[PDB]
Amino acid sequence: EDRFQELVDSLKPRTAHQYKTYYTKYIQWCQLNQIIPTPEDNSVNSVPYKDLPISAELIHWFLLDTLITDDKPGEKREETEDLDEEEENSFKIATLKKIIGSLNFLSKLCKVHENPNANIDTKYLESVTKLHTHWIDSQKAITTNETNNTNTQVLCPPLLKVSLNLWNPETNHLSEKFFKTCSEKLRFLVDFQLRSYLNLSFEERSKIRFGSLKLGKRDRDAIIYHKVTHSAEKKDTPGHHQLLALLPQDCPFICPQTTLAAYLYLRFYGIPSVSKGDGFPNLNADENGSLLQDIPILRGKSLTTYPREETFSNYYTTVFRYCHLPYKRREYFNKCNLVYPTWDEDTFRTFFNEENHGNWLEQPEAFAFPDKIPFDFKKIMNFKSPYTSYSTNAKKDPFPPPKDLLVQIFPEIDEYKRHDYEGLSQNSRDFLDLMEVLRERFLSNLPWIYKFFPNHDIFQDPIFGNSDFQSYFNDKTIHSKGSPILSFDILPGFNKIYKNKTNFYSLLIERP
Amino acid sequence: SFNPVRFLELPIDIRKEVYFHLDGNFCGAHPYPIDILYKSNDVELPGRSKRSKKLLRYMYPVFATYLNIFEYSPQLIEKWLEYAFWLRYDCLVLDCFKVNHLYDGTLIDALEWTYLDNELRLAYFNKASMLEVWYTFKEYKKWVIDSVAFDELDLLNVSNIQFNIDNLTPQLVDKCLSILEQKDLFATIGEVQFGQDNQLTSISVIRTIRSMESMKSLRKITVRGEKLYELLINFHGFRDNPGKTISYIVKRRINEIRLSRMNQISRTGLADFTRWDNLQKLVLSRVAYIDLNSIVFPKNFKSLTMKRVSKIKWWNIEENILKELKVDKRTFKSLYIKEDDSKFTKFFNLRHTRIKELDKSEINQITYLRCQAIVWLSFRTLNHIKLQNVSEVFNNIIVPRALFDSKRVEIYRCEKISQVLVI
């Protein structure tokens, strides 16, 4: 009781009762989920401070399930008016800062009551606060168009501008020699969508391999880039894992999975007459780290190498003068201060081991943490809304792709599925089902690529002009030739400006 | 069964000494004070009838601004809402406000303007920041003020109501000041507070300051933050700021400046009150570190009270005394200290500090008056000091004889303070 005098003096009485209200909500959430067991029912439960499980991930998962996974299964539909929703998510970010401060105070209260569990690791929650602050600032940037004289960049983001400019099969104004082939433009778009959607740097983009991308056993939509560091990047104690994810967008021209599958198709095959790819690999004697972890996800001068840096710097310069973007140093070379969290060994092994935490009524890996991934980083860095959190936002699929077009592209994976799927190593069949998911995404988002960019080098082969191809093309574009507005969404703020076809076609310089 | 009439028949000194210890807590649905809720190996947690649903649906959204803080254990709220109908009409409560206003704001502190139930009514908050009593100004003038102000016009005027922003939202600050503008009630308020939990002030603070000249009965200004102390009530070297500052005509009006909770007042080189040339008192309420060699202390102020501080430097009077009688500090402490405890030193206890004093026999009555002139040169005409809860004064504490007598200095919570020598 030595430190209780300067603990009450750290706060007002009003702020102390607000904080006790907020961690009373937290302990109610922990008792209804049985993280801490209740002593008895139909009695006043008096849990101690000595044994209260508090950590960064528990506080953040409370923040998920109460504050930012706004389900409300009878009253979700009161988010229509923009000013009311602006006041409401200003209230959300205010209560976010207040609950983070209250649970930080609860940690400071429990550490003096002999509880060795409550270490907050506050840079994690500061990254979460800065993430939600940046999302509220993006909503502020759209709702206030009188900020500066850069209103064209207020309407169109650099991401959509550079992405939509890099779907163009002709480069009469982009680059004469630098962006000749469509495969080089698709690997530049893969580099741009692994740099912008995933805040890494140049050498960590060089670390991307074939077998590093795992698969979602729960949701299947996320590209599970488990950045495994074997005790050497700056530090020992081998658990330093940064988990990354890529989800299918609403706009097909910003989806990274179809782009990745298109470039891996143009690397496995290429063009049968002009630009031949690298050829299909062995995938039969693949030891875990022998053939998949040596061939990069994008090629260069040699067949099995990573290219030169100033070539990509000049590519960035030519694209950003084509897209009218003043280039800086913080956004595309160095690491930002708004990134994915890296997990230390104890909290990465302990918190997700379900059999050691079997007393819980609902494990976090099942619903809120999709395969060891934070939810809000996932659905903010994909530019989505994390508020519905259990809806069918990603399950939008009218006119589903047939089964005859599955076997016509990538037949080797069908050959391996009719081969022994189990007898190979784990990364081999993991890469096989990975390319199956990527092929499904490519067959999904292919008719928009054919409709809005028909000059692309995929269709420089007379086997693709069959009846089923154009039949699925017409069956997907049957709801796009008679409507003045687009049927597919773009960005959660930008669905009331670029929903019309005129504003979307006006971003394209060559052949709108 | 408590009897109100038998209580209200006994005279007014006993009723003062009842309502002085009943701090402001008129209700039985008081929250637990925040000393047992932390000193516990337990967390009181919730776990709802036919009548309480009606109260939490109909009464509660009127009071959802100031009472949503107490959502932990909502038995407190469904005990509160049966007091909330009748407690403001109670005869004990109104008698407490009568003997408050008849003793000039001493008993229970600082009725507050607020805007709830669309009226701009007064409010009383206890120390746990809970409203208990809310009166509109017609009812407050009718049945408590006019029940004690029969015919003398020096007591009809009610000018002790605080204003207290950070209680309420800045839109409600704007609406409260607009309704206070359309009436002639700026002379009603008596003091303002400041919140905001380089020169970037909040909207409510600017709205409060831009109508602060209109009071003409304002004293007792106070702030609550170190990132707001430097912006309007410290001098800071700024000599020309037309907007956003605090309007030099109204710097003359105030009587004291309360400094609620901070870390240091001398974050810059000097924490100077060169302006506020008319304040008499100053109370440092929970500031962590203060340096008495870093305050400039205006031309005629009287009281420097201070409480709950963590470190005091001192006016370093000893370093100027040792230049005068020309000794070393060890020789001074060994030879020229008498530690006299005749009878007035033993009147107020101070059982933890040891009160010391210079020698009447080893100093020759002049260089004794010079040693006292050092102390009165370093104080510059203050009298009341009142050291409450403190810890670890750096320099030794030196207090003059004329001010240590008559109980004008008063160390109250003597735990880590020690060895106050009196010269």
Would you write up a description of this structure?
The structure is cut from a larger assembly and holds chains A (512 residues) and B (423 residues). Chain A is mostly helical and 512 residues long. Chain A folds into two domains: 1-149, no CATH class; 150-512, hpI Integrase, Chain A. Chain A contains 18 helices and four strands. Chain A has helices at residues 5-8, 13-32, 56-68, 82-112, 123-143, 151-155, 158-165, 182-195, 202-206, 256-268, 309-322, 345-350, 375-381, 404-408, 411-417, 426-452, 467-476, 501-505, and strands at 213-214, 224-227, 240-244, 342-344. Chain A has a four-stranded antiparallel β-sheet. In chain A, helix 4 (82-112) runs antiparallel to helix 5. Chain B is an alpha/beta fold. Chain B has 13 helices and 14 strands. Chain B has helices at residues 4-9, 12-19, 50-58, 77-86, 91-101, 137-148, 170-182, 203-209, 226-232, 317-324, 329-335, 369-379, 401-404; strands at residues 112-113, 122-125, 131-133, 161-162, 189-191, 221-223, 256-259, 281-284, 289-290, 303-306, 311-312, 356-357, 397-399, 420-422. In chain B, the strands form five sheets. In chain B, strands 6-7-8-10 form a four-stranded parallel β-sheet, with no helix packed on it. In chain B, helix 5 crosses helix 6 (137-148), helix 7 packs parallel to helix 8 (203-209) and helix 10 (317-324) packs antiparallel against helix 12 (369-379). Chains A and B meet through helix 1 and helix 2 of A and loops of B. Chain A: It comes from Saccharomyces cerevisiae (strain ATCC 204508 / S288c) (Baker's yeast). Chain A: Keywords: Centromere, Chromosome, Cytoplasm, Cytoskeleton, DNA-binding, Nucleus, Phosphoprotein.
